[PDB]
Design a protein around this ligand. Structure first.
Ligand SMILES: Cc1cc2nc3c(=O)[nH]c(=O)nc-3n(C[C@H](O)[C@H](O)[C@H](O)COP(=O)(O)O)c2cc1C
Length: 335
C-alpha cells in the first residue's frame, strides 16, 4: 500500500525521498516486462480520452509536469503508471547543480510542496543519451529547456539555441520555461530550428495585463501553446516563508485556476492551452478542461496520491464526460 510508502518517505528529507524513488524508477525502466506489468495494474486506456493535438497523439490528457524527471532517465517507468504524456527537464545546455540544499519542503496537511530547486540537471548531452537509451516511448514526450544560471542576459538567447540544438533529435515538443521584447525572438529563433510544437510556460504571479502582453508576443512569434502555471510566491502563508521557494499542490489550485480563466479568455481560440497547478482529482481536472485546457499536468498530487493517481482521475473523468453528454474529451474542451 502506498500509505506505508508515504509514511516511510515522508519521514525522510523530501529530496532524499525523491532520489530513492528515482533510483527505483531508473531500475524498473531497464525492464520492459516490469514496465508492462506496472501498466497492467495502474494503466487506464479509454478512447474518450484520446486526442490528436499539434500532430501528436495524446491517449489521455493527463501529463507529468516538468521537474519530476529532470534528466529524461525514467520515462519508460513513468509512462507505465498511466500518464498521457511526460515533460522531461528542465534541461540546460551544460550540467548544473541548482540551488543550495535544502531546497524542497513538504506541507503535508495542505497536500502541497515548496521548492527552490533551480534547474539541477545533468545537461542536455547526457539528457539526450538517456532519452535515447530507451526510445521510442509509448506517449508523447516534451522537453523543457532552460537557460544556464550564469549565462549573461546578453548571450542568453544563444544559450536557448545551444540547449535546443542539443535536443533537436529527442522529444515531440519543446517547452521554454520563462520581457515581451525577448519572447518574440526566442520563438522566432526556435521556429527556424525545428518543426516540433513550441510551448511557453508562465509563472502564476504576473499581473494580468503584463501576462497578456507576454503571452501575445509568444503566439505572434509562432508559439503553439501556453503552459500555466509554474509555482507561486504570492500566498504569504505563515508556515511557508518566501525563502523556501514557490508553492505547488493544493495551495496553488485557486491562483492557477484564476490565471487560467484569464489565459483562456484571451487566447483559447488562438493557441493550445495546458493547465498546471494544484490538480489533484478528476473534478478539478474536468473544470480545467471545461475552462479551455486541451491538456493537463501534475507534479505534487503524484507525491500525495501515488501510482493510482492516473487511473483514479481518468476513470472519474470518463464518468464526468458521460454524465455531461460528451462522447469524448474533445467535446468537453469548450467554454
Ligand atoms: C520539486 C519541483 C521541481 C520542479 N521543477 C521544474 C522544472 O525543472 N521545470 C519546470 O518547468 N517546472 C518545474 N516544477 C513545476 C511543476 O512542473 C509545476 O509547474 C508545479 O509544480 C505546479 O504543478 P502542481 O501543483 O501539480 O505541482 C517543479 C516543481 C516541483 C515541486
Amino acid at each position: 500500500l502506498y500509505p506505508l510508502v508515504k509514511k516511510y518517505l515522508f519521514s525522510l528529507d523530501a529530496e532524499d525521498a525523491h532520489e530513492k524513488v528515482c533510483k527505483i524508477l531508473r531500475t524498473l525502466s531497464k525492464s520492459s516486462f516490469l514496465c508492462s506489468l506496472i501498466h497492467s495494474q495502474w494503466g487506464y486506456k479509454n478512447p474518450k480520452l484520446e486526442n490528436e493535438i499539434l500532430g501528436l497523439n495524446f491517449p489521455n490528457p493527463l501529463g507529468l509536469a516538468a521537474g519530476f524527471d529532470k534528466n529524461a532517465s525514467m520515462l519508460r517507468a513513468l509512462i507505465a503508471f498511466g500518464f498521457g504524456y511526460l515533460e522531461a527537464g528542465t534541461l540546460t545546455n551544460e550540467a548544473q547543480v541548482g540551488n543550495e540544499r535544502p531546497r524542497l519542503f513538504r506541507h503535508i496537511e495542505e497536500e502541497s510542496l515548496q521548492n527552490a530547486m533551480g534547474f539541477n540537471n545533468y545537461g542536455a548531452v547526457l539528457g539526450a543519451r538517456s532519452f535515447n537509451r530507451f526510445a521510442p516511448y509509448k506517449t508523447p514526450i516534451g522537453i523543457n529547456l532552460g537557460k544556464n544560471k550564469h549565462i549573461e542576459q546578453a548571450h542568453a538567447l544563444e544559450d536557448y539555441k545551444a540547449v535546443l540544438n542539443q535536443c533537436l533529435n529527442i522529444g515531440d515538443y519543446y517547452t521554454f520555461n520563462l520581457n515581451k521584447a525577448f519572447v518574440n525572438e526566442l520563438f522566432c529563433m526556435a521556429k527556424e530550428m525545428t518543426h516540433k510544437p513550441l510551448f511557453l510556460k508562465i509563472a502564476p504571479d504576473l499581473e494580468i495585463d503584463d501576462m497578456l502582453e507576454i503571452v501575445n508576443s509568444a503566439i505572434e512569434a509562432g508559439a503553439h501553446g501556453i503552459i500555466a502555471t509554474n509555482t507561486t510566491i504570492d500566498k504569504s502563508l505563515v508556515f511557508a516563508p518566501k525563502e523556501m521557494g514557490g508553492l505547488s499542490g493544493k495551495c496553488l489550485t485557486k491562483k492557477s485556476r484564476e490565471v487560467f480563466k484569464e489565459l483562456a479568455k484571451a487566447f483559447f481560440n488562438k493557441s493550445v492551452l495546458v493547465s498546471v497547478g494544484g490538480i489533484s482529482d478528476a473534478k478539478e481536472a474536468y473544470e480545467r478542461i471545461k475552462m479551455g485546457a486541451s491538456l493537463l499536468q501534475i507534479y505534487s498530487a503524484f507525491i500525495y496520491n501515488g501510482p493510482n493517481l492516473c487511473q483514479n482521475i481518468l476513470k472519474d473523468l470518463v464518468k464526468l464526460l458521460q454524465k455531461d453528454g460528451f462522447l469524448s474529451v474533445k467535446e468537453a474542451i469548450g467554454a
